[PDB]
Amino acid sequence: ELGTAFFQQQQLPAAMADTFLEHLCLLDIDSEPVAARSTSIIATIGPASRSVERLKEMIKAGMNIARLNFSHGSHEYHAESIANVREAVESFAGSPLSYRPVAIALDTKGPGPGLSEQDVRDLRFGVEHGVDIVFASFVRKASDVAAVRAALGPEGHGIKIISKIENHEGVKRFDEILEVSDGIMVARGDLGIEIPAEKVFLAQKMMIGRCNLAGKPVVCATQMLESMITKPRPTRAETSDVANAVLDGADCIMLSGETAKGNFPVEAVKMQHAIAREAEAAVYHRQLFEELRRAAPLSRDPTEVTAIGAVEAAFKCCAAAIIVLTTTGRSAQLLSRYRPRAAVIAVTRSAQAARQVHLCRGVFPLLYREPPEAIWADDVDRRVQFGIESGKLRGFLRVGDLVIVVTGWRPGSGYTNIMRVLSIS
Amino acid sequence: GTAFFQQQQLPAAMADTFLEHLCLLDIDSEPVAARSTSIIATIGPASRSVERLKEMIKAGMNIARLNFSHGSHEYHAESIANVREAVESFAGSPLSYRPVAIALDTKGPGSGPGLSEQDVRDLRFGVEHGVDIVFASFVRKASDVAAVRAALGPEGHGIKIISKIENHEGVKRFDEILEVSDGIMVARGDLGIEIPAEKVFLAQKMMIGRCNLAGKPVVCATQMLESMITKPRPTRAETSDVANAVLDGADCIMLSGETAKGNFPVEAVKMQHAIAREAEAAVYHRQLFEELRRAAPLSRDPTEVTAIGAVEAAFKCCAAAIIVLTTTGRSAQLLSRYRPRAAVIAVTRSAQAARQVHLCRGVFPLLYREPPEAIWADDVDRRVQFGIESGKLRGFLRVGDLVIVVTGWRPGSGYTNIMRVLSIS
Amino acid sequence: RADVAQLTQELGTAFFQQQQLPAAMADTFLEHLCLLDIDSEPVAARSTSIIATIGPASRSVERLKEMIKAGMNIARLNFSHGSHEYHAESIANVREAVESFAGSPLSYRPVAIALDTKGPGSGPGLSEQDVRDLRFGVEHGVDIVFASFVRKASDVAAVRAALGPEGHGIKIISKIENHEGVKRFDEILEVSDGIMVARGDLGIEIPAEKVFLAQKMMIGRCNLAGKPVVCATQMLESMITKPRPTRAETSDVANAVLDGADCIMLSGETAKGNFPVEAVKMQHAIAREAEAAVYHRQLFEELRRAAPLSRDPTEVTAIGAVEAAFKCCAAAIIVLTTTGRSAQLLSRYRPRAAVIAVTRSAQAARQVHLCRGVFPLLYREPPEAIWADDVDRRVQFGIESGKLRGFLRVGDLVIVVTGWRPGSGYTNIMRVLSIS
Amino acid sequence: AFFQQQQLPAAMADTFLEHLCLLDIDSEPVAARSTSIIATIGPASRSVERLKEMIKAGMNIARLNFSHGSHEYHAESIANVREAVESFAGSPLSYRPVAIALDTKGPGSGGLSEQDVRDLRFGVEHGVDIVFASFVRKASDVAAVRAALGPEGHGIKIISKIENHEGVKRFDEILEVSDGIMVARGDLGIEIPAEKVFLAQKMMIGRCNLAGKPVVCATQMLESMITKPRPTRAETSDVANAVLDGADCIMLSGETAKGNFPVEAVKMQHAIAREAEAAVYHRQLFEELRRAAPLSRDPTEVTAIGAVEAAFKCCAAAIIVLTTTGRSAQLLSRYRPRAAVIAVTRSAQAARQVHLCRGVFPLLYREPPEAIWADDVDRRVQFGIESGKLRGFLRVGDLVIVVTGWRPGSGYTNIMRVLSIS
Numbered sequence A: 001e002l003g004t005a006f007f008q009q010q011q012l013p014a015a016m017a018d019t020f021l022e023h024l025c026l027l028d029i030d031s032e033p034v035a036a037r038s039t040s041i042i043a044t045i046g047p048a049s050r051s052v053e054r055l056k057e058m059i060k061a062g063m064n065i066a067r068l069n070f071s072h073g074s075h076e077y078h079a080e081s082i083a084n085v086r087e088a089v090e091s092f093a094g095s096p097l098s099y100r101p102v103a104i105a106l107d108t109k110g111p112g113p114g115l116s117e118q119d120v121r122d123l124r125f126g127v128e129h130g131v132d133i134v135f136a137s138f139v140r141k142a143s144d145v146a147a148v149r150a151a152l153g154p155e156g157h158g159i160k161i162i163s164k165i166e167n168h169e170g171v172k173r174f175d176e177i178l179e180v181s182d183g184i185m186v187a188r189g190d191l192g193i194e195i196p197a198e199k200v201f202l203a204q205k206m207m208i209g210r211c212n213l214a215g216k217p218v219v220c221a222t223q224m225l226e227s228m229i230t231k232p233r234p235t236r237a238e239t240s241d242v243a244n245a246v247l248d249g250a251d252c253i254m255l256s257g258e259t260a261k262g263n264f265p266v267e268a269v270k271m272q273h274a275i276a277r278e279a280e281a282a283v284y285h286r287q288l289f290e291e292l293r294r295a296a297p298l299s300r301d302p303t304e305v306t307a308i309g310a311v312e313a314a315f316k317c318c319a320a321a322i323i324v325l326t327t328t329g330r331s332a333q334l335l336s337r338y339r340p341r342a343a344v345i346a347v348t349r350s351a352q353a354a355r356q357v358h359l360c361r362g363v364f365p366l367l368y369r370e371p372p373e374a375i376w377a378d379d380v381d382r383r384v385q386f387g388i389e390s391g392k393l394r395g396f397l398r399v400g401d402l403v404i405v406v407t408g409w410r411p412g413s414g415y416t417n418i419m420r421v422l423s424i425s
Numbered sequence B: 001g002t003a004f005f006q007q008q009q010l011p012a013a014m015a016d017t018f019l020e021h022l023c024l025l026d027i028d029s030e031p032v033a034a035r036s037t038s039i040i041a042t043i044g045p046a047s048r049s050v051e052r053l054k055e056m057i058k059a060g061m062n063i064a065r066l067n068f069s070h071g072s073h074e075y076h077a078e079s080i081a082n083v084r085e086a087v088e089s090f091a092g093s094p095l096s097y098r099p100v101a102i103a104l105d106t107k108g109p110g111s112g113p114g115l116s117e118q119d120v121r122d123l124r125f126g127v128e129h130g131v132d133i134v135f136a137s138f139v140r141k142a143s144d145v146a147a148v149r150a151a152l153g154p155e156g157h158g159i160k161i162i163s164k165i166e167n168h169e170g171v172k173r174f175d176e177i178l179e180v181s182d183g184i185m186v187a188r189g190d191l192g193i194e195i196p197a198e199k200v201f202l203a204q205k206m207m208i209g210r211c212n213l214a215g216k217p218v219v220c221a222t223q224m225l226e227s228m229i230t231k232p233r234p235t236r237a238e239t240s241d242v243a244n245a246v247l248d249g250a251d252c253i254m255l256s257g258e259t260a261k262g263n264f265p266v267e268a269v270k271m272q273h274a275i276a277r278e279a280e281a282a283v284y285h286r287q288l289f290e291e292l293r294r295a296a297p298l299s300r301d302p303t304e305v306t307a308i309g310a311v312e313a314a315f316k317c318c319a320a321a322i323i324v325l326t327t328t329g330r331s332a333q334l335l336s337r338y339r340p341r342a343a344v345i346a347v348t349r350s351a352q353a354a355r356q357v358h359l360c361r362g363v364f365p366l367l368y369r370e371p372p373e374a375i376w377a378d379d380v381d382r383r384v385q386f387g388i389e390s391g392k393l394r395g396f397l398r399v400g401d402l403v404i405v406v407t408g409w410r411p412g413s414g415y416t417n418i419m420r421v422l423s424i425s
Numbered sequence C: 001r002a003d004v005a006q007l008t009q010e011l012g013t014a015f016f017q018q019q020q021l022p023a024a025m026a027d028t029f030l031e032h033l034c035l036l037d038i039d040s041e042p043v044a045a046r047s048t049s050i051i052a053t054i055g056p057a058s059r060s061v062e063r064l065k066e067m068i069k070a071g072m073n074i075a076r077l078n079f080s081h082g083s084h085e086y087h088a089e090s091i092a093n094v095r096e097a098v099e100s101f102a103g104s105p106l107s108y109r110p111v112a113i114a115l116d117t118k119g120p121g122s123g124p125g126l127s128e129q130d131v132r133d134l135r136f137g138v139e140h141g142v143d144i145v146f147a148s149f150v151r152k153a154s155d156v157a158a159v160r161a162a163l164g165p166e167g168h169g170i171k172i173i174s175k176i177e178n179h180e181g182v183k184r185f186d187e188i189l190e191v192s193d194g195i196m197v198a199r200g201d202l203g204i205e206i207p208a209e210k211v212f213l214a215q216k217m218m219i220g221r222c223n224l225a226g227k228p229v230v231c232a233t234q235m236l237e238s239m240i241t242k243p244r245p246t247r248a249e250t251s252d253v254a255n256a257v258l259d260g261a262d263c264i265m266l267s268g269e270t271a272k273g274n275f276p277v278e279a280v281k282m283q284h285a286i287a288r289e290a291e292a293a294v295y296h297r298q299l300f301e302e303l304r305r306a307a308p309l310s311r312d313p314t315e316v317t318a319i320g321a322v323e324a325a326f327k328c329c330a331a332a333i334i335v336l337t338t339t340g341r342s343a344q345l346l347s348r349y350r351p352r353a354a355v356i357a358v359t360r361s362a363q364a365a366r367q368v369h370l371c372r373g374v375f376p377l378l379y380r381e382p383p384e385a386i387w388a389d390d391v392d393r394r395v396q397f398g399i400e401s402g403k404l405r406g407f408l409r410v411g412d413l414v415i416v417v418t419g420w421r422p423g424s425g426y427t428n429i430m431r432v433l434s435i436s
Numbered sequence D: 001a002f003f004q005q006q007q008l009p010a011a012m013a014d015t016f017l018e019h020l021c022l023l024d025i026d027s028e029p030v031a032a033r034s035t036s037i038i039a040t041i042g043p044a045s046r047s048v049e050r051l052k053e054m055i056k057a058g059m060n061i062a063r064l065n066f067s068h069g070s071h072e073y074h075a076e077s078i079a080n081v082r083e084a085v086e087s088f089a090g091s092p093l094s095y096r097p098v099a100i101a102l103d104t105k106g107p108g109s110g111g112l113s114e115q116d117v118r119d120l121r122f123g124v125e126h127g128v129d130i131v132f133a134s135f136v137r138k139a140s141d142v143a144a145v146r147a148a149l150g151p152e153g154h155g156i157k158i159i160s161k162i163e164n165h166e167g168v169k170r171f172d173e174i175l176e177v178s179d180g181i182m183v184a185r186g187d188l189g190i191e192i193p194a195e196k197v198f199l200a201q202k203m204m205i206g207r208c209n210l211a212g213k214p215v216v217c218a219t220q221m222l223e224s225m226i227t228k229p230r231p232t233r234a235e236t237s238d239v240a241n242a243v244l245d246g247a248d249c250i251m252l253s254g255e256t257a258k259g260n261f262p263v264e265a266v267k268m269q270h271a272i273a274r275e276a277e278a279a280v281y282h283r284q285l286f287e288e289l290r291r292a293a294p295l296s297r298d299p300t301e302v303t304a305i306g307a308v309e310a311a312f313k314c315c316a317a318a319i320i321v322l323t324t325t326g327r328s329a330q331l332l333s334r335y336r337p338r339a340a341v342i343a344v345t346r347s348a349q350a351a352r353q354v355h356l357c358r359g360v361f362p363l364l365y366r367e368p369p370e371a372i373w374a375d376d377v378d379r380r381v382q383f384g385i386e387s388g389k390l391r392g393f394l395r396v397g398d399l400v401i402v403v404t405g406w407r408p409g410s411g412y413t414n415i416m417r418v419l420s421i422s
């Protein structure tokens, strides 16, 4: 039905292993990855990656989130970077095979007591320019997040706040920070200066583990491919670091100087893309799924209940994708937390949700712009078919495949409760 | 509430090891779930009175067994008529009506090598009288099952054949017999004479294990409550034997002389009911579900994929029930094979399928009698509402419970593909 | 298959087909059940002890010799019936039958004598008849007391006090027979040497459909504590009048062994029935089949995970010896013991290997029958001048007795467990020896 | 306080996910660093005074890269290493043996090259302990290296370097005839796509752990430390992940051979390895190693499993083992005990070679002999205890597992004893 060739690809012999030791022993360099790369790539915009033509090459290479580092540059400089990103993104609104939403994230300069005056002004700039995410620098406690949230004013409550953990206090107060944040960034640069360099891997693994347990995005950042600022190829430690961040459970991986100022910004994005694809196939889903299941408390929320049912069904049939309809991205995030091998294709009418779901591993957003049908059930079927046809066009799906489809019982956010098994025709 | 988590051996259910699970079993933890292992009662002089049969149905009898080793065809036709008269006396309340299957147990081949002439005549009697199940005596190989199937003719294509394993050859050729049978009966009486008495428990445990792995019904039979033929209370070994047959994984438990000729037929049914309810709560679902999922192969059949998704969703939310619409009983059987703690309420229009699904542990059949609605989606919803209303009346459901609803995308058998999370209102 | 390939080439495919070894290698309990085979013959010596109640059907010396040969390890005297004179005669007949085999020290079978008390009756604590019967037990040298209707820790303290300073070595097995005993189980087990799941009264005191829960819970907790647990009452009841038991009875015996019972008991089946010897033979045959069907892979992992870390060298040596025995498919673990404690600590990890306990104490040799898998050998030789040579002689006695008894063959590996100095409490050494 | 140190809350976790969640930057490592450090000797690390600092920093194996330098150059490096090592021999209870490994140039465009034959002969003549054989592609390459060592070099350990696709594909046949493996990531990263090297590393480490044979992770682990005093975030993560993967040894090449911070690079590897060893999830690792190790009738194999099990049961500070060839210590090491394996040996070569096995701390026995063999054994065990107390491995009141044999000579280990310290 699928063939022996299917079961030799994407580390499937290592996937069937009964122990983690046997899983390692069965990893094969000749077993090619087939699934689309699920860990998002955040690229820092700077002199080496500002031009519209360079940004088009970075989008093609795999960049999903453009980071603006507000530690340098004026508001005028960053507004031009935003306009260049949006111009490069919209240049592909013709071909549906190449069009992809790209999120814009603002990284603050940092704190002094309370939020700095420059951070208040930069956060206001972000709201005025429609940024999707804020990477808040030096978050140490829950009140630091509340201050950033308050500065996002009356108009920016939909912006995701990713708290950067950069010091001992942030690590110690991690649980209270994660509870009030949308996600976390393991900011290894400052963290490696604030705590002993030999302890950073413990903080990284702990934070990734806790974010995976909470179902919240976690970004691994800084010096992942550092030598690529001046060299065309990374060191053996650098490729290992990227692979291990993905195996640890990071939703996003980041490039800073590699894309902002280095000589090989596009090559650095290509390298992160190539490593993440290899590492995602090497994940030991048998143990991961069982442990995510065992740790996750019982839930009476139908979205959470449908999500675990859909992920279980996708593993049972080797589903090419899980197509989910989402207004805020939440139904896609709840599927993503169980780490399915199947791609989560999120169909949405919200351009902001489409950009923000790049924070969740394995979510491939599709922005639906067709006008509503008069009959709601027909409008749902048209969006389900839109995900199927986009999936066929991009290579996720073929006729005869099985897909899991996740929808809700009435319009509006918060009513997901249906999982369907569909044969692609 | 805290009271909820003290009942149905929930502290023992949360245990991390089987040893800790045994340590946490509590005699004060009352069973809450409806009894899921079916009771087969043999009909005889002690249980043919229509008024006595009504008491046995109320006590929990699900399948009435006619032992063709004793009595004439005229005697068995009167047994069938009395069973049907007692069963149909409750049809005036469709929300509480309990279907009861009729099983024909053959005399056997005797000194012959294959199907005897008396068995050919008895099987034809069964088809003419509309029996639901055949317990075929002394099945030794796959060709014995084919001969029973041939003797049932074209009119008896829907009858379930449960092969009785009663000797060494049947145990050795078990795999080939199970492959062509609808299920198995561990016929301990003859088996204990054909093989050493001290080895029967090994054959019982092996056969139950293999049937659970195949997703096919398995019946534990003979001398389970033997002393209740003359005494009002069973021995300590007898109550333990019933509990252990349920813990082993038997779908059905049987009564022979206890109901056919003894002085306490109703009390024997009540005792099996009481023990099975206690033993089902003591099942270690944490290990059982993991092992059934791991052993079950990948499937591209949407009914099988929806079944595992629905069972996973039911465990996630502590669903009171899985309501499934079924024509042949197949969708209910595929849910049952994963051993959910949630009751599988099977709503069907087929009176025969309603009787036959008693062979699957945890399937509670409801016979829907209303003619089809003009709009198919309304007819589906009416059947689901009938399941909810029957469930509320019988104590399976309460307002505020979560229920998993399993349906298909079009009319007719074979199209189950939808799982939905529903709150009981 | 790579984890057993070399040992399969060495020991042969026939070795790995016996004693439910394909079911033993299974990765899940479901696959373990699927691989159980009625043609896979048991090889190991029966490890669950059989307690037989002595009565009119089993009191003669000649009948007792047949019961010892059939497998009886513990003789139970039910003090609910019979006078002190009647029970003293039963004790003398048991000792005469047991000593008739003492001529060959290498094959002699010690048999424990257990006194089962009448109980408190309508009273709240220790009755006057129990005080008199317990003093009779001390005066007649009984090894074990099965204390009836234990409801709390003070009930066992009262039994201990009635035994006096002379009965300090007697094992107290508390009988759990009612709701209060089940609810106060933890405090009772803490002060008892073991437990008896007394299903007869328990099945009257609590709903009959709940007894299996109390049995499984108590066996689980005793296995966790490493203390003996006895499953009792109506196991082979129909064998009082019939030569073959019912299908529920053979299942009940097998399930008590699979649950983890150290001992199984016969009451009326041996005390008053028409087939006392056949009932013992049936329990022996079922226990051997059920012991091979135990899923050691999960059981050993769970016993290890649940057992707290220990700084007691006897406990540390015990787990190391059991681990080593599983690694090499050791035929036996030979242990030197004074009180039986080192053998009990090996037994709590449920090795597949027989635990051959070499002791000079006749009482400890009788009492270790309470621990599953312990085969006592009574050493009658006087001590050597050099302690190290005396220890080596005792180990060689175990090997030679094991060879003559069929436990050990040339080429087998055995694990030997000893201590660093004389006296109880100093076990700390494990050795791997090849049988030549 | 005991249960807050060495990641013990994370060690008690019921799942790997919970284990990650409980990792604590404030939980200080207490156990001695188990993963050996191999430092390449070059212009930056050739002086006797420099080598003494590197030994104090944690260097266990000195690597001589025969791709560069003459035989005269390498003989001087060997003499300087031995002079620095022997400067600490005055205190036998604290003396640290250091192995000398010869890394061959390789076959180049060719089987065994003529320069490799000459270099291997040099190694035997100069008493090297280990050979890192370059570009091993099949079992016959190992046989050729073994033949070139001759009858005088029967005791030298051959660690096969896997550097290309053929070596990865023929891994099982190479490991079967080798003493261990080196994941030579430099050439491997050029021979196969750079994004696939982590898969080859994890597979090879897993298979060596399964076989109970040493595995070395090598190349660019702390590359930026050649010119900078601190490594990058990717470099510290790489070292930690090689240890978490299961590497017995970690290596420094240019960082020690030609870089500006050779001592600091050794100190950095030491600090990271200690932190990573405490973060190992022993609960799962021991169960998996135990399950996968085949049944055995070899008493040394049987005693080793029993001793490791007993060490975990009592939180033993150490397993003290008497060994002639190092084999009894290697069989204990394969089960990855948390307890240090203190190997007491009279063989100076075995003391150097057991650095290839994670968690084996060699002690070279040089005390006068005892006339009674039982007394001589007891004295070697007391020597293990005293050196352990002096070095901080043991304290009074600790439990240790002692692994001895029933008669003199190698191959007779069969005894495990539980001993209370002082």
Ligand SMILES: O=S(=O)(NCCc1ccc(S(=O)(=O)c2ccc(O)c(O)c2)cc1)c1ccc(O)c(O)c1
Pocket: A020, A021, A022, A024, A209, A212, A247, A248, A249, A283, A284, A285, A286, A287, A288, A289, A291, A292, D016, D017, D018, D020, D206, D209, D244, D245, D246, D280, D281, D282, D283, D284, D285, D288, D289
């Ligand atoms: O299922 S996974 O992809 N886990 C694999 C990672 C892993 C498990 C266990 C160990 S171990 O130290 O026990 C060990 C190390 C090396 C061995 O050879 C060995 O046998 C055992 C190390 C590493 C996963 C990832 C992230 C999670 O949050 C999660 O819940 C599960």
Ligand SMILES: O=S(=O)(NCCc1ccc(S(=O)(=O)c2ccc(O)c(O)c2)cc1)c1ccc(O)c(O)c1
Pocket: B018, B019, B020, B022, B209, B212, B247, B248, B249, B283, B284, B285, B286, B287, B288, B291, B292, C029, C030, C031, C033, C220, C223, C258, C259, C260, C294, C295, C296, C297, C298, C299, C302, C303
């Ligand atoms: O390892 S053992 O020898 N026997 C395991 C007995 C057992 C385990 C699990 C279940 S289960 O309900 O999960 C289940 C039932 C039926 C299936 O087919 C299935 O896959 C799973 C039932 C029974 C053992 C005995 C006593 C102990 O105290 C102990 O720690 C371990």
Ligand SMILES: O=P(O)(O)OC[C@H]1O[C@](O)(COP(=O)(O)O)[C@@H](O)[C@@H]1O
Pocket: A325, A326, A327, A328, A329, A330, A331, A332, A406, A407, A408, A409, A410, A411, A412, A413, A414, A415, A416
């Ligand atoms: O993931 P979210 O934000 O809750 O959105 C899920 C919602 O999407 C839907 O599937 C479709 O709703 P709309 O037609 O309003 O887009 C709802 O039925 C469901 O509640």
Ligand SMILES: O=P(O)(O)OC[C@H]1O[C@](O)(COP(=O)(O)O)[C@@H](O)[C@@H]1O
Pocket: B325, B326, B327, B328, B329, B330, B331, B332, B406, B407, B408, B409, B410, B411, B412, B413, B414, B415, B416
């Ligand atoms: O379990 P079965 O026999 O396959 O029946 C399931 C069928 O029942 C339904 O849910 C309802 O079908 P009907 O309207 O024909 O009764 C179908 O959609 C589905 O295919």
Ligand SMILES: O=P(O)(O)OC[C@H]1O[C@](O)(COP(=O)(O)O)[C@@H](O)[C@@H]1O
Pocket: C336, C337, C338, C339, C340, C341, C342, C343, C391, C417, C418, C419, C420, C421, C422, C423, C424, C425, C426, C427
């Ligand atoms: O199991 P116990 O009661 O602790 O006895 C074990 C004891 O037996 C021995 O092996 C032998 O002791 P004895 O010489 O006193 O008989 C002791 O070394 C050890 O302490």
Ligand SMILES: O=P(O)(O)OC[C@H]1O[C@](O)(COP(=O)(O)O)[C@@H](O)[C@@H]1O
Pocket: D322, D323, D324, D325, D326, D327, D328, D329, D403, D404, D405, D406, D407, D408, D409, D410, D411, D412, D413
């Ligand atoms: O690990 P190896 O090489 O097998 O050496 C272990 C040997 O060491 C000993 O413990 C002591 O032997 P020596 O007295 O020869 O040093 C032997 O009993 C044992 O066989």
Ligand SMILES: O=C([O-])C(=O)[O-]
Pocket: A137, A164, A166, A186, A187, A188, A189, A190, A191, A221, A222
């Ligand atoms: O700010 C950052 O990204 C850091 O410190 O690593």
Ligand SMILES: O=C([O-])C(=O)[O-]
Pocket: B164, B166, B186, B187, B188, B189, B190, B191, B221, B222
């Ligand atoms: O026929 C039967 O039911 C039997 O033999 O047990």
Ligand SMILES: O=C([O-])C(=O)[O-]
Pocket: C148, C175, C177, C197, C198, C199, C200, C201, C202, C232, C233
């Ligand atoms: O006393 C007993 O043995 C009982 O009640 O079972």
Ligand SMILES: O=C([O-])C(=O)[O-]
Pocket: D134, D161, D163, D183, D184, D185, D186, D187, D188, D218, D219
């Ligand atoms: O030779 C080496 O060490 C390499 O290639 O990495």
Ligand SMILES: [K+]
Pocket: A069, A070, A071, A107, A108, A109, A110, A137
């Ligand atoms: K910044």
Ligand SMILES: [K+]
Pocket: B067, B068, B069, B105, B106, B107, B108, B137
């Ligand atoms: K019949």
Ligand SMILES: [K+]
Pocket: C078, C079, C080, C116, C117, C118, C119, C148
């Ligand atoms: K009594």
Ligand SMILES: [K+]
Pocket: D065, D066, D067, D103, D104, D105, D106, D134
């Ligand atoms: K070289």
Ligand SMILES: [Mg+2]
Pocket: A137, A166, A187, A189, A190
């Ligand atoms: Mg920073």
Ligand SMILES: [Mg+2]
Pocket: B137, B166, B187, B189, B190
């Ligand atoms: Mg029969």
